[PDB]
Amino acid sequence: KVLPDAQTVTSVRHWTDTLFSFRVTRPQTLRFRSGEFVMIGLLDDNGKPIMRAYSIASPAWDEELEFYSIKVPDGPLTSRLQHIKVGEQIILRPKPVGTLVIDALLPGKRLWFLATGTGIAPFASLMREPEAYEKFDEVIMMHACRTVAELEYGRQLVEALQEDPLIGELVEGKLKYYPTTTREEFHHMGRITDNLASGKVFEDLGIAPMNPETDRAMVCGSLAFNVDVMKVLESYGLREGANSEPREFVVEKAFVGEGI
Numbered sequence: 001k002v003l004p005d006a007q008t009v010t011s012v013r014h015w016t017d018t019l020f021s022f023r024v025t026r027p028q029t030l031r032f033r034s035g036e037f038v039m040i041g042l043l044d045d046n047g048k049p050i051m052r053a054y055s056i057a058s059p060a061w062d063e064e065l066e067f068y069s070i071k072v073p074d075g076p077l078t079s080r081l082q083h084i085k086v087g088e089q090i091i092l093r094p095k096p097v098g099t100l101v102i103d104a105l106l107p108g109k110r111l112w113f114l115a116t117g118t119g120i121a122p123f124a125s126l127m128r129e130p131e132a133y134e135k136f137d138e139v140i141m142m143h144a145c146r147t148v149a150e151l152e153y154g155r156q157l158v159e160a161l162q163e164d165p166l167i168g169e170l171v172e173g174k175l176k177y178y179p180t181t182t183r184e185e186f187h188h189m190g191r192i193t194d195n196l197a198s199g200k201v202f203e204d205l206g207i208a209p210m211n212p213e214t215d216r217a218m219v220c221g222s223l224a225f226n227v228d229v230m231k232v233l234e235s236y237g238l239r240e241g242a243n244s245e246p247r248e249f250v251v252e253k254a255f256v257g258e259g260i
């Protein structure tokens with residue numbers, strides 16, 4: 001059974017028939033930076049581990065670890081994981097890594113989180129990271145999904161941040177949220193690549209145009225989504241970097257392959 005690096009589910013919350021979030025106890029010695037991912041999983045029928053990469057959806061200070069997950073019909077992990085219940089366990093490898101970290105960027109004045117689908121997961125972490133509002137004056141969350149229902153987890157998160165009297169102040173008109181659908185009717189629509197290139201996002205939010213001097217960005221989507229967004233960023237004069245030589249943006253795959 002689930003014994004290796006076992007942690008315990010403390011809460012579960014379903015959002016759509018393809019999306020759910022959950023939280024589990026944190027390993028005692030685990031330390032990470034907001035944005036990083038880890039390996040989790042469950043045993044298959046024969047007792048073999050089914051391991052998968054997951055961004056930690058909670059910020060570094062949170063006492064429990066949060067995850068925002070797809071539900072793949074017939075997906076080896078999530079076909080099983082979607083039916084997880086409080087009190088049940090999961091395997092968790094306490095080896096955080098990744099390049100969606102503030103340290104992997106040149107310091108600047110504005111920070112952009114550019115995501116689609118479950119790619120908002122590392123930004124559910126980072127948007128709740130103190131350092132994000134310390135090192136930057138403005139934090140822009142662009143989230144693009146096909147439907148209004150897929151935006152809800154993210155929408156509730158940002159609502160909680162903007163309303164809470166304490167955080168609401170600490171995040172003093174710094175956090176800007178721009179959700180869009182690409183298929184379903186919604187007050188705000190369009191692909192991140194198009195809304196960034198056209199300059200429409202700037203008019204809607206009422207913000208200064210993208211500037212390589214000051215703007216820094218993180219991209220988390222399908223490989224296809226990362227490619228297109230890289231181009232638009234580079235058109236603005238921003239260059240890809242990392243911990244080795246930090247520049248103005250970083251990208252990570254929300255998953256491998258084509259996507260649900």
Ligand SMILES: Cc1cc2nc3c(=O)[nH]c(=O)nc-3n(C[C@H](O)[C@H](O)[C@H](O)COP(=O)(O)OP(=O)(O)OC[C@H]3O[C@@H](n4cnc5c(N)ncnc54)[C@H](O)[C@@H]3O)c2cc1C
Nearest residue numbers: 052053054055069070075076077078121255257258259260
């Ligand atoms: C760096 C990294 C971070 C990741 N973070 C998350 C995360 O926080 N939340 C999460 O749900 N998944 C995340 N993924 C994907 C995750 O590792 C698994 O692929 C996922 O749990 C589904 O596993 P499965 O075995 O059920 O399906 P798989 O056998 O892994 O894949 C089945 C198919 O479903 C599609 N798919 C898989 N994951 C997604 C996704 N998240 N969104 C849309 N389509 C998908 C792909 O087309 C894939 O071909 C991440 C992947 C990487 C590489």
